[PDB]
Amino acid sequence: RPRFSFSIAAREGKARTGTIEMKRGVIRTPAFMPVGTAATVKALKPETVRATGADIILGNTYHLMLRPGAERIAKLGGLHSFMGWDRPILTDSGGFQVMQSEEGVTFHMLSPERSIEIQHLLGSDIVMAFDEVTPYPATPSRAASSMERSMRWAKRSRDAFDSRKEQAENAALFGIQQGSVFENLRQQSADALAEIGFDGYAVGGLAVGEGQDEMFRVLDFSVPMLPDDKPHYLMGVGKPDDIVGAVERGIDMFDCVLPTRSGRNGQAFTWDGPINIRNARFSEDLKPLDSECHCAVCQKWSRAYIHHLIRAGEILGAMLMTEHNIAFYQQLMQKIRDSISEGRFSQFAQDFRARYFA
Template sequence: QVMSLSGISKLTEEAVTFSSHIDGSKHVLTPERSIQIQADRLGSDIVMQLDECVAWPAEEKRAREGMELSARWAQRSKNAFGTRDAQALFGIQQGSTYENLRRESSERLQEIGFDGYAIGGLAVGEGHEAMCEVLDYAPEFLPKDRPRYLMGVGKPIDLVEAVYRGVDMFDCVLPTRAGRHGQAWTWDGPLNLKNARFAEDQDPLDPEVPCPASQDYSKAYLHHLIRADEILGKILLSWHNIAFFQALTAAMRAAIAEGTFEQFRRDFRARHLKA
């Protein structure tokens, strides 16, 4: 990623040039090359434009530079992608925490025209409340008849609050990264299975989650696996976390369909944040 590899990359109007962390070799990634890799070599169902995600915090001038470069790269990405029947291309809204820049970014992307639209540049250190403040307006700048995708998010409470504000899609490494570090997400918040208080706990992780890792193993056993650094512990917690996130999104879809999402959100916040 352009931002996360900023220490070993050079950004120009034309491309991003990376130095390999393995052997120092140079690799050039243009918007066109990015599309070729995703759409042609990987056969991705959803292809993302190449963009610049400006690090937070950012002065408005710097945020505008990144937004405008991303908009120019969006056009180049669209030109390279063309029209495809079985693959979708998403543009990425940028603008940091500046409402005027988010609006302008959205307008420029819609002029180009994409199959879906992503909200980028969040979950980069600004915190939950600041993220929600941006989401109070950013999704509304994007078309309602196209998927709206919040990139790199996140914690369960982030997902619920983002859906409340009009977001449809998410991606995040959190379920498996948390699992590798001994953390399990539940309806009552996160559990750190490294803690000694779980050493004799014979209850399952979360019987409400329809997953063997959630229902069939005691917290004591999982605690033992994590403390012993057994790979099985990381696998089981990752499996549970993915199942929990699936259960959460299924519950949100059901609440939306039933017209009860407002109550679901209130109940979830009360239960999840009390931990």
């Protein structure tokens, strides 16, 4: 396989489906990437993650640099070897968590150069440029300032990535668009990123307090500013309905802690909407979490059993809920991909929303 190749197999309106080819494997898009916080996808073995249908997972640069440490992971053979996942891994830049001067942030120090270096040490396949994230809400002036600084940092990220032969030859680098909710700033950011040139483009600075309406509004004008022939990554999104709407607006890649996090909380996603398995109504319910879900949990265990485990604080409860939720997300992405390929994604989105919010 090549270092990086994105090919669009089918389109319906702004929606696209296709594949990203990388050295460690193929990523089907639109893609959902389970999040590995501390070199583990919470409560799941890597084989189980893969079995749900995930093609790629996300590693957190901020957490890993603190524990166990980027240099230590490199010494142990890199993140893939360390955690036992041999498929692609995307690493975030640390910009969101660390949230200062033009050189970078101290807190430990983090700069475009150090972020790139850490992601190299981890052996990341998709490296994220180091950005400054504009809080929401933000004045036009402050958003411009942050966006401008992030573009300077994007250039610095690009140069640091390119200066490392092994990294430049084997990994990909994504730039991150900023600019808050302002069309002009988004435009300038997109223009700047494209001038620099990246393998993929992320829409950053969303899902930070604004509602879905506003997020969708910003996506409407922002995604078409990005190069059409490269992947579009919406960071930290999100709920199933957020995902469907973002694909309708041209997004190809997603990540969120939601399915793992809310799993441990007792929230299970279903085609009829989320349920909280702790609710007493499930104490004697012999049905699986979802009657259509094809995951291993739904094939074997009842709502009543999982209800009991989650109420009792048992680790197996977290394991089963997380597997289900991640498998649900992958099934959602599969149905999205199929519907786009078949030119019926518009209908799928409508049918999906009608049932999920019934």
